Design a protein around this ligand. Sequence first.
Ligand SMILES: [Mg+2]
Ligand SMILES: [Mg+2]
Ligand SMILES: [Mg+2]
Lengths: 90, 90, 90
Amino acid sequence: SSVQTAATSWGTVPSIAVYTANNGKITERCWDGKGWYTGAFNEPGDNVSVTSWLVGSAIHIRVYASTGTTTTEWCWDGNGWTKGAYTATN
Amino acid sequence: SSVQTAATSWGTVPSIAVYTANNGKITERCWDGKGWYTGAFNEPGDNVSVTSWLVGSAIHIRVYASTGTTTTEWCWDGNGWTKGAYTATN
Amino acid sequence: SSVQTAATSWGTVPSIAVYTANNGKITERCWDGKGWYTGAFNEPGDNVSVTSWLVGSAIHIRVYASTGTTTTEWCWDGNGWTKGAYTATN
Ligand SMILES: [Mg+2]
Ligand SMILES: [Mg+2]
Ligand SMILES: [Mg+2]
């Protein structure tokens, strides 16, 4: 048993975000070209995936957090995290 | 035990595809800027990864589906899924 | 129990790299538009994630290799792999 990670990168820098699922929680570490710091994201999950896109002045990040058969989408859109509309089936 | 996901995004929209391995099968959910729908992809796997690239009028998606020690590549190239040439070793 | 993969793609080609964790080791397979070959990367891990970015003449790849609660970042920057500064917490 090992922790599970997901990574994304963006920008003219570039910047990196790494999400780690451990002990039922996903946390976030971010690289800005100088150092790693802990991001604001902290939500439940045992498995994580991520994707992102940069448009305008905002990175948009989507984190898919799964526990059991429930996957929750978390959305960063420039200045905050909110729960997304993702569902695994209709 | 939790389901396992992989996510990719593309386009001036953007669009998102999320692949989920559950019960030995990988299925696909897609976002088009308005809603989530179920994609055509349905192949066996217990672990999944994905990458994609947009060139021309087609998103090209590569899904790596693993069961045991066998990983199968599935290729979307604009208008259909086909098995790729990927092998894990020579 | 299945092997675990992570995939990234880049370039005007494009090229693909697929990393597989199996038996405690991560290995690398690469596609150049013609065939799959085995990459140089070979480091311990039970879980893997990846991201990459292309700037200049070099693909830059970051591989996050986890065993237990330890995640090690491996950095490709055009012509070699080195251990990165990533840590999971301060
Ligand atoms: Mg992704
Ligand atoms: Mg990927
Ligand atoms: Mg990634």
